[PDB]
Structures are given as C-alpha cells and as structure tokens.
Write a protein that binds this ligand. Sequence first.
Ligand SMILES: OC[C@H]1O[C@@H](n2cc(-c3cccc4ccccc34)nn2)[C@H](O)[C@@H](O)[C@@H]1O
Length: 810
Amino acid sequence: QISVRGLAGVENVTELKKNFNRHLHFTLVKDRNVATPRDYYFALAHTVRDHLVGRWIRTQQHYYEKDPKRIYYLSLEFYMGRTLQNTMVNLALENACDEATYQLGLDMEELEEIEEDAGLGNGGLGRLAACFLDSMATLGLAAYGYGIRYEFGIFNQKICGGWQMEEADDWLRYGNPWEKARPEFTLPVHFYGRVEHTSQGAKWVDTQVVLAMPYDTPVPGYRNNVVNTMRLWSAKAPNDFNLGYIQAVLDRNLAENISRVLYPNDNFFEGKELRLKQEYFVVAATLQDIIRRFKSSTNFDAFPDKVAIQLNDTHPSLAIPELMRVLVDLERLDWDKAWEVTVKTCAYTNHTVLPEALERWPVHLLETLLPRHLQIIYEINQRFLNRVAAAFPGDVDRLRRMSLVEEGAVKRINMAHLCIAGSHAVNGVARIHSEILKKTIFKDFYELEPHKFQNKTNGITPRRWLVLCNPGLAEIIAERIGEEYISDLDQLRKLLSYVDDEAFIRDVAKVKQENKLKFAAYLEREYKVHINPNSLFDVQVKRIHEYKRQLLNCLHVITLYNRIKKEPNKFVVPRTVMIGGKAAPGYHMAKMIIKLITAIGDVVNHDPVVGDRLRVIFLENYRVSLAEKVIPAADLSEQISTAGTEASGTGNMKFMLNGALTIGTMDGANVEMAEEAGEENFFIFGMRVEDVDRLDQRGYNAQEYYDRIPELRQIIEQLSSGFFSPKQPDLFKDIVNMLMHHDRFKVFADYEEYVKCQERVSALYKNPREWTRMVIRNIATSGKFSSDRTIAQYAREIWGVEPSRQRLPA
Ligand SMILES: OC[C@H]1O[C@@H](n2cc(-c3cccc4ccccc34)nn2)[C@H](O)[C@@H](O)[C@@H]1O
C-alpha cells in the first residue's frame, strides 16, 4: 500500500501464506474452523520469527569469527512493548505480511492488537534501554542487553471511581513466541554465607544457591540483517533445595520470587531486601556469562579491550565489586591490576539528581546478604579516600562528603559514589543535566577526576517512534527526500526547504488529522468516550510525579473552565486535554493527582455551558503501545517539569518527531530541542534553573502567589470548599496543603507565565497554515534526537568502538 513498508512480491506473499498455514496446523494444532483471533496472531508471529533465525545464527557466528569488542548493557529494566510490527519493519516484511494476511481474509492490524506489551520497565529509564538495543543493532555493534525476565512487568492500571487500581501484568499467560530458553547456560548465583580467610586469600562459604536460567530475545537491526541478543535471567531453585517433603517443594518459591515482579517505583528509594537480591542476581549471572564468553574467544590485561559494561543507573552497581571479587578471589589477580581492569571496563549513566532517588543501602543488609562484597567495598573506599586525601590535603569535610560509606543513624553505602570511583566514564543524559552533575551533586568527584565526566544527550529510535507508529508521516517525508533518513535522521533538515511548499503543508496537516480521527475512534471503540477531533489535542503522558507537574496542567485546565463560565458566549479555541500515566502504588500524592484529574473531568465534561469546547480525559493504562497511538495524534506536547528536575526526557523527542508543538520549561533536553528548532518555534515559559536557585535562597512562599493572583485564589478556593468533590468536600485537602505549605517544585511560581504562554498556543492554532509551518520546522530539526546519534557517541567516546552501517549477507 505505502512505500516505506517494503515490497509485496509475488514469491514472498505466496511463501508467507503457506508458512502461516503450516504454523496454524502444525504449531498451533488448529484449522480455520476452530481458530481464534489469538491463534491467528500466533501463526503470524511464528511466520515472522522464522525470518529472524537465519540472521540470528549467522550474526552470532560472525561475532565469534571476527571477535570484536563486546558491549554489555546492564539494566534492571527493558521497556520493549510489542515485538511483531517492529520485527516486520526492520526486516522489510510489513507490506508482504499485510498482503498475505489480507488474502487469507484477515486484518493484520487487528492481529497486532492481540500481542501483549513486554512491560519490563517503569518509564523513561526502561524505554531508553529498549531504544538503545535497537540503535546498537542498526549500527552493527556486537551488543548484548542483560536484565531480568520478570514474570510480572509493570501493573495494568484500571481506573475505578476515579482512583487507580493495580492488577498483575500476567504477560506470559499465553506464552512468549519471541523468547528462546537457553537452559544449557544455567548459572549459579550465591547469597548469604560468610567469609573465611585462608593462607591463600579470602573464601566465600556456606552460601545459598539460586540458579539463573537465561532466555534469549532477538534484537533485529534496521534492514542490515544484524540480529543481536537481549538475554534475560530467570530464577530457579536447585533440585536439592530444602531437601516435611511437601513443604520443602513448596518453599522453592522463596528462591524463585527473585525474578517474579518488577519494582514499580519511579519515585522513592526503597531499601527492600528482595530488590537488592534482584540487583545482585542479574549482576552475578551476567558477569559469569561475560567472562565465559571472553575465555571461549588467562590474560585479563586485554579484558577491557574486548569488554565494555554499561551500567544503566546504579541498579547494577554491584558489577564493580563483583568483578573485583571474581578477579581477586577466583582468578588470583592482585588488587591493583584487578582494579585497573574494572575501571577500564565499567561506565556509569545517571538519570536523576533527586536525592530521594539515590540508592543508599544499609550496611547491615549487605553484611547479611553479601558479606564479601561489603569487605571489597570498604577496601575500595579506603584506597579511594587515600587518593582524595593526597589531592586535597587537610580537607576533612571533603573526605566525608566523598566517602562511599555514609555515617549516621544507620550506616549506608552510597552506590553512586561507588559507580564514579569504579568507572572510567560517568555521563548525564542531557547537556544541562550533565552540567548540573558537575556543579552540584558530583562536584567533589568532578574536581578529583574531571576527565571521567561526559554528556550523552538522550535519543529515541525513529523506527518504532516514526515508521512503526506513524507510517503516514514517514511516507510523505519519503516522497520528498527518499528513505535514507530512517537510519540517518539528520537528513530531515532537507525538509526545511519545503516549509513554504503548499502541497507539503497540506500533507503534513492531512496526516495529523487522519491520526486524530483514528485516535478519536479508538477512544470510543475501546473506552466509549466522545471527543471532538477538530479541537487541539493537548497531551501530557508520562509517569505521575510531583516534579513533572501534572498539577500545573490541572491548574491551567481549571483556569480555562472558569474563564468559559465567566464569559460563556466568548469564542475559545476548543481543546481536548489528555493526561495519562501510572502512579507508583505507594506514592500517595501521585494517586491523589490521578483522582483530581478524573474529578476535574467529571465537572468539565458534563457542563452544558462548556459544550465540546473543553474536554478533560484521563488516558488509562499508559504504556508503550498506547504511546504509539496517542503521540502521532497530538498537537501540543506538555513538558512542564520544574527547571532542573527532568534529567532529559524522551517523550518530548517522540512528540517533536511526530508533528506536535512543545510547551515546556528550559529543562532537560527541552533546551537542546529549542536550540535545534529555534526558540521562535518552541513555547518556552517559566523559571530557568538560575531563577529556581534565587527563589530557594530567598525562600519559596506559595502564599505570595495566592495573595497576588485572583484567578489562582479562586482555583484553590474551589479545591478546598469541595467544588470538585461534592460528596467529600475535603477530599483534596492534601493537595492544597502541599501546594500552600510544602511544594518542592514551585507549581505557583510558574502559573502566570504558563497560562500566558498557553494563550499564545491557542492564538497560533487559529491559523492552521502557520501552525503547520512551525510543525515542519520542528520535524526538520528533530534529527539530533535519534538514539543512533546517542549510541554512536557512546561507542566512540566511551566504549571505544566504531559503528558500521554495512549489511551482513542475507
Ligand atoms: O535517561 C532516560 C530517562 O530516565 C528517566 N528516569 C528516571 C527514573 C527513575 C528511576 C528510579 C527512581 C527515580 C526517582 C525519581 C525520578 C526518576 C527515577 N526513571 N526514569 C528520567 O527521569 C528522564 O529525565 C530520562 O529521560
């Protein structure tokens, strides 16, 4: 049908049709008479999967023969979403499979909707890992994703009476056709025990053993025949575990609970023992596998020349003392050589400056669970503080600030300090975030070792985030500039010469309208809610957190409603305001914000005076596959975090690529986005980081804003008096109290500029042609934000490897 989706050749369609019928019969044990739509999806999944295997076997064979430097991306989260359409896209099978299934009398899009998201992540940090795997394969790097195969991913979010309810995400219920179990690579992981000192070094004895069984998922590059591996560990009890008899067998679940469920915290460091076990489990199993593969290529001097380990936050930070443990205790290298290998192998990426997010493990926990690693950490710290003392003589406070061991009520290990000390490179995820790291939380470390500190601005994959989710836009772009931009997103600059092109202007606008119509229908068909597709689609989608200021959005929405009620017969640009995201189950305020949003909607959506001029919708169960639907449909992207709090953002980049304009603060990657597009083409408002600092020194007094802004006072009075909760007048007392007395993120301080800037958005929207030309200027300058660029920078400046766009033989 459309060009970017590949050729539908006669030979291919015939072959796909027959393999589909073979799988339906032989693999699913069905015929067309009793086959469910789920069987049809599975037959298609198996057909497409067959096209991966040849390439997967010869990519891994290629890496054995060539022996390149291997990249190991260690993460507790891989937010993958669905695999079927992405596989077709990267293999150029999409039109062919579409045609083949059409001829079989099936609708492929309906079949695609049956696949469960692999929801093995919470939000931005997990999705980054997934975009990274895609870019690494596309750039022909010998890269492996390593994580945990959770039985249950992020919870499915249900909204009942306006409240979030969580339910278990049983994503493996019907089976996962994309994974291949590799039980021949099952590995032992040790916990507890104690340390014995012999004549010949320390020994870790009396341990409990949990087995780690790997499951391999293919990661196909874009049209280059490269298929890399994401290896995920599953916990298994050994067969003599606890071995009355029945209880012993039932108790096996204690060991296997390690890989049962993803921790759903996007907010507040929870020092739970099960989480620590998860962190060590993935680290211990991965390092054994890395070393095994290294040996199967004695000499550990060359180890860093053949191995790079990237740590996705501090979650796999135990890789540092674990590598030391293996090298010193098992391989009998001396400390200094082992440490040199470790530093040169490891690199650390930070994703937040919020103090409550930092991992600070109680010493008594590491004492019990990992006695040897605690000893190694103490030795690391001692030798590190000796270096600090020699560089800054007499600076006793610097020593205690930089210590990996924090003294207090309970002694803690600071895992971020561990990571910096044990890594040859430390990076932030956007230029401003990376500067904030050097100036504030890691200032002392930067002064000691300035060369370790880097920036690597985040990116998103244009395969999933344009071609897959927005074929219409990819096609009109391809019509003018060809197809090469899909793996070379900088080529989108060539679209700047079409900004005054009347045909292109009309096409860009047409595609958006089609996307909005399709999404407006999806809402009714799946959720029975009626929206006006001619309104401006104002969308804020991301995890619910106070720093992200969904509450500032709420205040604007209430302002618009009150202004309508004040002057009913005045014209206003119609808006559909969509807010979506999950709240961490124990985050009370985040759960209150969800309830506020639905409560606002209850009032706004049923006011006869309002009509269809304003709608407030809460997007339930936001996740990767819903993002693929709503993002192409958006006109306005809300990126309104308090300056200095959003490390980068990646949702922002998705919206920019898909033809939405951005309203945002100068925070994270918004700064670089505005810089690329030009500030005239961006809706910037609010305090800069400097302004936040000034307010903090003086003291933030919310009351001042309440007293001086009559429209704000009215909103707070409506919330307090029970205007949005008639049966429970004091329901939102917590929200008001927080806003008035302990708002860390200064919601009121940005309110005036925000509302004013929102008016400028509505003004532009009244002029479709000038709205669309500004959109073109955004899409055209979005090229920097491809994770292909990000990964090439990691590759060259951290890992020491050269990317390749060359095909492997088919
Ligand atoms: O680098 C990729 C993205 O990572 C995001 N992120 C941060 C976190 C995160 C994990 C664990 C605890 C956290 C606590 C507070 C804020 C974020 C947390 N999860 N995702 C960052 O919040 C976002 O700015 C960035 O674009």
